[PDB]
Amino acid sequence: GSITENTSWNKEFSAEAVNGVFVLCKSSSKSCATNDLARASKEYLPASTFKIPNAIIGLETGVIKNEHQVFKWDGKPRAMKQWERDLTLRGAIQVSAVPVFQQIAREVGEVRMQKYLKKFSYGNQNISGGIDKFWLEGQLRISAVNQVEFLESLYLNKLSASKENQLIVKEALVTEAAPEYLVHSKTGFSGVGTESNPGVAWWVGWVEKETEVYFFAFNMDIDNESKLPLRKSIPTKIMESEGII
Amino acid sequence: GSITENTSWNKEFSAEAVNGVFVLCKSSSKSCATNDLARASKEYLPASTFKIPNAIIGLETGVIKNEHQVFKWDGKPRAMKQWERDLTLRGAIQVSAVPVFQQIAREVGEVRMQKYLKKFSYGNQNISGGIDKFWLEGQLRISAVNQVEFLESLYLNKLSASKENQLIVKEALVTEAAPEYLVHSKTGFSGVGTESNPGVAWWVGWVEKETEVYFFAFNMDIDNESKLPLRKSIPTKIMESEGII
Ligand SMILES: *C(=O)[C@@H]([C@@H]1NC(C(=O)O)=C(S[C@@H]2CN[C@H](C(=O)Nc3cccc(C(=O)O)c3)C2)[C@@H]1C)[C@@H](C)O
Ligand SMILES: *C(=O)[C@@H]([C@@H]1NC(C(=O)O)=C(S[C@@H]2CN[C@H](C(=O)Nc3cccc(C(=O)O)c3)C2)[C@@H]1C)[C@@H](C)O
Ligand SMILES: [Mg+2]
Ligand SMILES: [Mg+2]
C-alpha cells in the first residue's frame, strides 16, 4: 500500500532519545502512517514476534495437534522461571516461552518453515542460522510495514493457512478485552546487543474499536533493559493522540 | 462427569438475600460443584445468554456471513442509546443488542432454529412464543447444568457446527484477558417479572487459568433491577474462594 510520513510523531521519540519507528494503519494497509518512512521498511530480527507465524505453522503442519494442546514442561531448567510449567498455546505465546517454540520449530523443520515463510511473505524469509534460533540470533529480518501486512492478513484470515488455525492464533494473541475495544498484540525484544550494534524491541498488533480496525507495528533500537517500558509508552502515546486508546 | 453439592457456598447467597444457584466445573477432573443440586437442574428463560447459540446458528446458516460482518444501525430508535450505532458481532454480543439478534433469529427461521437447538441439546428446545422472542418471553428454558454442558462443548469445538464458527463466537465472548487468565462470559436478565413469579438473571462462561479450564453458570431470582450487581458479585466471591482469579 502507501506509507505517509507524519514527522510530528517524532516528538514522542525525541523526548526519550529513542531511535525507532511506529507504523499505524486504519482499516487496511492500503494507507499507513509513520514517523520515519525509511525505517518503516527497514528489516530487523523478529525475536518473540516470530511466535505468531511459528504458531500458525505449527498448527498447519500438525506439529501442534490442536488448539488445546498442552506443552508439558519436562522439569529441566528453562531460561526464565515463568516458562518452567505446563503451558497452553495461549500461555506459551503470552509468557513468550521460547523453548516451547524452539521445539515446535525443530519439528516443523527447515523445509516446511522455509515453505511457510515464503507463503506468508514474511520478511527476508531467511531461516539460516539454526532451525531453533534463526529468529533469535540468525539472519531472519522483517520490517514494521511487513509486520502490519502479515497481521492484516491474519486478521482477515487471508494467510495461506486454514481459517481455523488463524482464528486459534488470534484468540491466543488477545491482550485487552472490553465491550467495544479489543487488542491483539505481541511484544518482542532481541536483547541488548551492544552500544554500536543495538538490539531491537517490538510491539506489534491491532486494535478493534467499534467498527474500525487499526494495525500497528513499533520497533526501537535498545541497548539497556531499562528502556523497555518505552516500547509500549511511545506507541501508546501516539495512538492516544490519535484518539484510538 | 460428576457433580457434588457444596452447602458452604450458600454463604454468599444468604448474606445478600438471594435465591439462585452457582455451578462450577473443573474440566480436568470432569467434576462440578454447586450450592443447590435441585436449582442447578431447574430450567429458566435464557434471556441474553441465548445470543451464544443464536450467534453460532446465525453463522452456520449463513445469515451471518462471517466474523467481519457489520450490523448497521438503521437509525430507528432502540431501547438503549448504546445500541444506536453500527456493531460488529463481538460488539452486538458484548453490548447485548437485542434488535440485531431478533433479526438474526427471524432470518434463521423456525425450522432451522429448531434443528440446531436439538443438535445443541439446548434446554427444553421449545422455541414456541414467536421466532423473535422465544428466549426472552416464550417457552424456551435451560438449566445451569445444561448451560455448562453447552459451553463445555463450545470450548471443545464439539458442538454440531463448524469449528470456525465456534472459534468466531468464542473470541466474541472474551471479556477479560491476562497472559495466563482468560475469561469468556455472557450475562443475562429476563426482566423483573413479578414478585410472585420473578425474572431471572444469569452469568455464564468459563475461565482458562494456566492449563485448567473452569465452566460456570449462575442464575438467581430477581424482582428489582436494583440487585443486578449481585449476579457477578456472588459467583466472583465463590470463584475467588476457590483460588480462581
Ligand atoms: C521475545 O522477544 C523474548 C522476550 N520478549 C521480551 C519483551 O519484553 O519484548 C522479553 S523481556 C524479558 C521477559 N520479561 C522480562 C522483562 O523485563 N519484561 C519487561 C520489563 C520492562 C517493561 C516491559 C513492558 O512494558 O513490556 C517488560 C525480561 C523477552 C526477552 C523471548 C525471550 O520471550
Ligand atoms: C439480556 O439478557 C438483556 C440485558 N441483559 C442484561 C443483564 O444485566 O444481564 C440487562 S440489564 C440493562 C442493560 N444495562 C443496564 C444495567 O443496569 N446493567 C448492569 C447492572 C448491574 C450490574 C451489571 C454488570 O456487572 O454486568 C450490569 C440495564 C439487559 C436486560 C438484553 C441485552 O437482551
Ligand atoms: Mg525472542
Ligand atoms: Mg549494552
Numbering used by the authors:
A (entry chain A), B (entry chain B): 20 to 264
Per the authors:
Carbapenemases are the main cause of carbapenem resistance in Gram‐negative bacteria. How β‐lactamases with weak carbapenemase activity, such as the OXA‐10‐type class D β‐lactamases, contribute to anti‐bacterial drug resistance is unclear. OXA‐655 is a T26M and V117L OXA‐10 variant, recently identified from hospital wastewater. Here, we have solved crystal structures of OXA‐10 in complex with imipenem (IPM) and ETP, and OXA‐655 in complex with MEM in order to unravel the structure–function relationship and the impact of residue 117 in enzyme catalysis.
In summary, the crystal structures highlight the importance of residue 117 in OXA‐10 variants for carbapenemase activity. This study also illustrates the impact of a single amino acid substitution on the substrate profile of OXA‐10 and the evolutionary potential of new OXA‐10 variants.
